Amino acid sequence: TPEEKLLRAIFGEKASDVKDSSLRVPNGVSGTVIDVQVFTRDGVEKDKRA
Amino acid sequence: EIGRTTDPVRMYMREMGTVELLTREGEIDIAKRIEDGINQVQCSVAEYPEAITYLLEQYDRVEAEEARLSDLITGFVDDPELAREKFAELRAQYVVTRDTIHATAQEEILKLSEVFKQFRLVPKQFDYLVNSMRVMMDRVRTQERLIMKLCVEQCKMPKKNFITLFTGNETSDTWFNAAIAMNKPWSEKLHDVSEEVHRALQKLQQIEEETGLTIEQVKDINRRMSIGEAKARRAKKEMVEANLRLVISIAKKYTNRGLQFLDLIQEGNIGLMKAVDKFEYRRGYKFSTYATWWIRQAITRSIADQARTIRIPVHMIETINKLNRISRQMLQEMGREPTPEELAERMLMPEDKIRKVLKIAKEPISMETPIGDDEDSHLGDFIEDTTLELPLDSATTESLRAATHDVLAGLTAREAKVLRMRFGIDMNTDYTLEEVGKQFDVTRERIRQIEAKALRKLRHPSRSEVLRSFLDD
Amino acid sequence: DLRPLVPLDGGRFATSDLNDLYRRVINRNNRLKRLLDLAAPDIIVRNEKRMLQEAVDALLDNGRRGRAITGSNKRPLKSLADMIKGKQGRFRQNLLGKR
Amino acid sequence: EFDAIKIALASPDMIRSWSFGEVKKPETINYRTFK
Numbered sequence: 001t002p003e004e005k006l007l008r009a010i011f012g013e014k015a016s017d018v019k020d021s022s023l024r025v026p027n028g029v030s031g032t033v034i035d036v037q038v039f040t041r042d043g044v045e046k047d048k049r050a
Numbered sequence: 051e052i053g054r055t056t057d058p059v060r061m062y063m064r065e066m067g068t069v070e071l072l073t074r075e076g077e078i079d080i081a082k083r084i085e086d087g088i089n090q091v092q093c094s095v096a097e098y099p100e101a102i103t104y105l106l107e108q109y110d111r112v113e114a115e116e117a118r119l120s121d122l123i124t125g126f127v128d129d130p131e132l133a134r135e136k137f138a139e140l141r142a143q144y145v146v147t148r149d150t151i152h153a154t155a156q157e158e159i160l161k162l163s164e165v166f167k168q169f170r171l172v173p174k175q176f177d178y179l180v181n182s183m184r185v186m187m188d189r190v191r192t193q194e195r196l197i198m199k200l201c202v203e204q205c206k207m208p209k210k211n212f213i214t215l216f217t218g219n220e221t222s223d224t225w226f227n228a229a230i231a232m233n234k235p236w237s238e239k240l241h242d243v244s245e246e247v248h249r250a251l252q253k254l255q256q257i258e259e260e261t262g263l264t265i266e267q268v269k270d271i272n273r274r275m276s277i278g279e280a281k282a283r284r285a286k287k288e289m290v291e292a293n294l295r296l297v298i299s300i301a302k303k304y305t306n307r308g309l310q311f312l313d314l315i316q317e318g319n320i321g322l323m324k325a326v327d328k329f330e331y332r333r334g335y336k337f338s339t340y341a342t343w344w345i346r347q348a349i350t351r352s353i354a355d356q357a358r359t360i361r362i363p364v365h366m367i368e369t370i371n372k373l374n375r376i377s378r379q380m381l382q383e384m385g386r387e388p389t390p391e392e393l394a395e396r397m398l399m400p401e402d403k404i405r406k407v408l409k410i411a412k413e414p415i416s417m418e419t420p421i422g423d424d425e426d427s428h429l430g431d432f433i434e435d436t437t438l439e440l441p442l443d444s445a446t447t448e449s450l451r452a453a454t455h456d457v458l459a460g461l462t463a464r465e466a467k468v469l470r471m472r473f474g475i476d477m478n479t480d481y482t483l484e485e486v487g488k489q490f491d492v493t494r495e496r497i498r499q500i501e502a503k504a505l506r507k508l509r510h511p512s513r514s515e516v517l518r519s520f521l522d523d
Numbered sequence: 524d525l526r527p528l529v530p531l532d533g534g535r536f537a538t539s540d541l542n543d544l545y546r547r548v549i550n551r552n553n554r555l556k557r558l559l560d561l562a563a564p565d566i567i568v569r570n571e572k573r574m575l576q577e578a579v580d581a582l583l584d585n586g587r588r589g590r591a592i593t594g595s596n597k598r599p600l601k602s603l604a605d606m607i608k609g610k611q612g613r614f615r616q617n618l619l620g621k622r
Numbered sequence: 623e624f625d626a627i628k629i630a631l632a633s634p635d636m637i638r639s640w641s642f643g644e645v646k647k648p649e650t651i652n653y654r655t656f657k
Contacts, residue, residue, distance in 0.1 A: 001447060002473060002474040002475055002476075002480070003450065003451060003454050003473065003474075003475050004447075004450065005473055005474075006454060006469070006473040006475060007450070007454070007517060007520060007521065008521075009473065009505065010505055010508045010509070010514065010517065011517075011518055011521060013521060013523055042389075042391065043391065056577075056588055056589050057589065057590075058570070058573045058574060058577055061570075061573060062570050062573075065566055065569070065570075066566065283562075286564075287564040290563070290564055290567075291564055291566055294566070308595055310547075310592065312570065312574055313550070313551070313554075313574070315570075316554060316558075316567065316570065316571060316574070317554075319563075319567050320554075320557070320558070320561075320563075323561060323563060356546070356550050356648055359528075359538060359542060359543060359546055359650055360536070360650055360651050360653050361648075361649055361650075361653065362653045366653075409534050410534075410653060412534065412535055413595055414528065414531075414535060414536030414537060414538045415531065415535060415536065415537050415538070416537075416538060416539070416540055416543075416594050416595075416596065416598070416600075417527070417529075417537045417538060417539045417540070418539070418540060418601050419596075420598075426611060429537055430537075430539070433527070433529050433537055528650060528651065530656065542650065545645070546648040546650070549645060549646070549647065549648045550648050553646070553647070553648075
């Protein structure tokens with residue numbers, strides 16, 4: 001929108017091409033993580049934690 | 051005899067089960083009849099000298115290094131230049147025939163038809179020139195309507211005698227004009243329509259000019275044309291209405307590709323038409339083997355065309371069908387099922403186009419799919435619009451508008467104007483700094499320093515800290 | 524946007540059945556024009572006009588015809604008048620009482 | 623704003639009025655792009 005270009009020009013921050021869509025715990029729920037599995041597409045190279 | 055039904059496949063099977071199928075050599079005589087129809091049309095073509103000269107014009111044109119001869123002729127019954135020698139023959143024959151301004155004219159026209167109609171002619175050339183002949187028929191019929199309107203229903207001519215002098219003269223100024231002094235109810239009524247009928251006669255005599263043979267013959271040519279056309283269309287109906295059942299068989303071959311039964315039947319039926327118009331009888335060969343590939347390709351192009359609600363081309367559906375064949379082969383030759391980077395050897399594709407092809411193959415879901423447990427909540431009740439904006443977003447945007455408004459209030463006039471012209475604040479599209487210097491008629495670099503100074507002041511603590519508070523980073 | 528084709532995760536699509544019914548009608552109509560262009564025997568044009576009549580009739584109600592033309596799945600298509608009539612139409616459901 | 627709601631038949635002139643185009647082909651999307 002106009003004028004957010006204005007604000008960003010007055011402060012000069014980066015319009016990062018990446019948008020946050022990270023899985024978060026739902027609201028109210030408050031537990032403890034007890035197992036974290038990671039699947040992969042076999043063409044994909046595995047990450048660190050996987 | 052039957053009660054009723056709706057079931058349009060029912061009415062179709064009914065109406066197609068009237069005709070008996072065929073009898074061998076009956077089909078060959080039907081193809082004989084269709085050859086008779088093309089015969090009469092080509093004959094009526096060749097007996098038209100204007101069409102002959104048109105053909106000659108096109109011939110030289112394509113022979114002038116403008117197109118291949120196939121754009122001229124689909125060959126003759128012979129390398130090329132056979133057409134060139136044939137055109138030399140017909141050129142000499144036509145010049146000798148126009149050298150008879152009634153000594154050898156009709157014998158020459160029969161000779162010209164028998165010297166060019168021997169081998170072949172282009173279908174598209176045929177259509178263009180026959181539509182030209184129908185243009186001549188347009189002028190014929192329009193002259194008819196003009197001279198009938200201007201004679202009988204307008205001022206009460208007797209149409210019997212009206213054509214009775216049309217039969218015999220048809221073009222001059224006595225079969226109409228010598229009527230005008232007949233002293234009848236109409237004869238003393240043709241004096242206000244005299245000029246229009248006069249000019250109409252002039253255009254008919256121009257028809258005589260632009261055709262050669264007599265205007266009655268100019269209508270007789272396309273009359274034989276139409277008669278041959280009926281001769282073809284009749285018994286073409288016989289052939290197709292016979293083999294509709296053949297169509298129905300291979301139509302049933304494809305019943306669950308996402309395209310209803312009668313759609314497949316009609317597609318195969320169009321294929322059957324295209325086969326019959328191209329079918330040869332002289333091959334001494336069975337018709338059904340010729341119609342089968344045609345109907346198959348037609349129906350298959352249909353099912354690749356409009357089966358899915360998202361059209362993918364023939365090549366993608368052929369690749370998909372090959373992958374389905376190769377998987378239904380490989381599941382047992384391996385035992386359980388093939389994985390995408392296993393078909394890299396069974397098929398020779400890049401092993402990622404397989405990925406995208408497997409991605410594309412699925413069909414979309416009906417938005418009223420009954421979701422589980424049989425509640426009436428369908429998938430439609432679960433599709434959110436990710437295009438609307440949150441009202442928190444709207445309030446943020448408008449409050450941001452206000453904040454910048456009262457900030458820019460805290461500046462001069464030229465600074466605020468420069469910042470509403472440089473950024474598109476409360477205005478149309480953002481002005482350029484070139485347009486800046488165009489509207490203030492000023493120094494570019496000094497204006498850039500103006501807005502840098504504005505930015506510097508806007509950096510000020512206790513002056514824009516709420517503004518950076520708008521920055522949610 | 525009233526018969527949407529929103530995208531679903533992983534490349535599937537969610538269409539409304541009005542899209543399928545419109546596509547049926549457009550296919551059959553264009554084929555009818557392609558038939559009149561070649562001037563087929565009256566049997567085929569009669570069949571095609573029957574097919575068009577049935578297609579428009581189903582797009583209007585998808586009833587009144589014995590076997591309502593089911594979708595890909597073996598369920599009947601929710602026709603246009605099946606967005607008005609009844610306990611699931613707009614009237615009793617999304618106009619009188621809203622979420 | 624408006625006192626009443628009226629209903630009637632719609633002549634083909636009317637349906638040509640509402641129509642901002644003539645749908646001619648069964649395509650919906652482009653299977654690679656989604657335009």
